[PDB]
C-alpha cells in the first residue's frame, strides 16, 4: 500500500478519496518545426513527458503535450514547459546559433489582451487561444497603429 484504499470517515458518511502527486521528466526528443514564414526556424521538443511522483521518483505517463495546458502557439505550435529551443537568429553581420532551454522557470505568465478589454483581466469565457475584438482600429499610413496590450507583469 503506497496509495490509499477507500474507507469512510464516520459510520455511513459515504466518503472515498485517494491522492495522486505528479511531475514531468525533461524530455530530449528532437522535433525541428519547419518555418519558412520567418527566417527563424525553431525546434521544440514534445513539451515534457509527464510522470507520477510515487515512491519519490518519476514513472512516465507519456507525452505531456496533449496533457498539459497552457502552451504558447507559435503559429499554432505547442511550446510549453520542459523543452529546448535551438535558435538560429539572424542579423546584418550574418547569423548566430544560440540555444535557450525552455524551462517552467522561463514559463512566464503573459496574456496579450485587446485595447478595449482590461490588460490584467484575462478572458476565460472567451476561447483560450482566441478572442474576437469588436472595436474599430483605423490605420493611417504614417500612424499604422495595431494597439494591444502585451501584459508583461
Amino acid at each position: 500500500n503506497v496509495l490509499p484504499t477507500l474507507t469512510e470517515l464516520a459510520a455511513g458518511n459515504g466518503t472515498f478519496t485517494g491522492s495522486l502527486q505528479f511531475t514531468i521528466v525533461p524530455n530530449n526528443t528532437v522535433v525541428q518545426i519547419p518555418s519558412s514564414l520567418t527566417k527563424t526556424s525553431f525546434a521544440v521538443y514534445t513539451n515534457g513527458s509527464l510522470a507520477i511522483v510515487l515512491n519519490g521518483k518519476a514513472y512516465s505517463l507519456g507525452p505531456a503535450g496533449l496533457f498539459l495546458l497552457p502552451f504558447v502557439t507559435y503559429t499554432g505550435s505547442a511550446i510549453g514547459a520542459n523543452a529546448t529551443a535551438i535558435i538560429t537568429v539572424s542579423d546584418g553581420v550574418g547569423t548566430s546559433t544560440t540555444q535557450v532551454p525552455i524551462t517552467a522557470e522561463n514559463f512566464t505568465p503573459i496574456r496579450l489582451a485587446p485595447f478595449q478589454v482590461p490588460a490584467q483581466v484575462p478572458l476565460p469565457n472567451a476561447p483560450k487561444l482566441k478572442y474576437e475584438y469588436n472595436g474599430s482600429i483605423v490605420i493611417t499610413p504614417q500612424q499604422q497603429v495595431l494597439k494591444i496590450y502585451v501584459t508583461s507583469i
Binding site: 519547419p34 519558412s36 502557439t73 503559429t75 499554432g76 487561444l129 482566441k130
Partner: protein
Amino acid sequence: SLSVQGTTSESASVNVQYVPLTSTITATVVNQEGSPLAGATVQLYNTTSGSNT
C-alpha cells in the same frame, strides 16, 4: 499545407511527394562462342499501340 483555422490559425507546411512510374526493358545477345556480343543493334517497338511505334 494545413491551415488549421480553429481557435488558432495554425500554419503547417507538410511536404509530400510522388515518384513517377517508368518502365525499363533489357535485351541480351549471346551465340555459340558463349561470349556477349557488342555492337549489335536491338530495336524495341512498342507493339501494344496497334503498330510498330
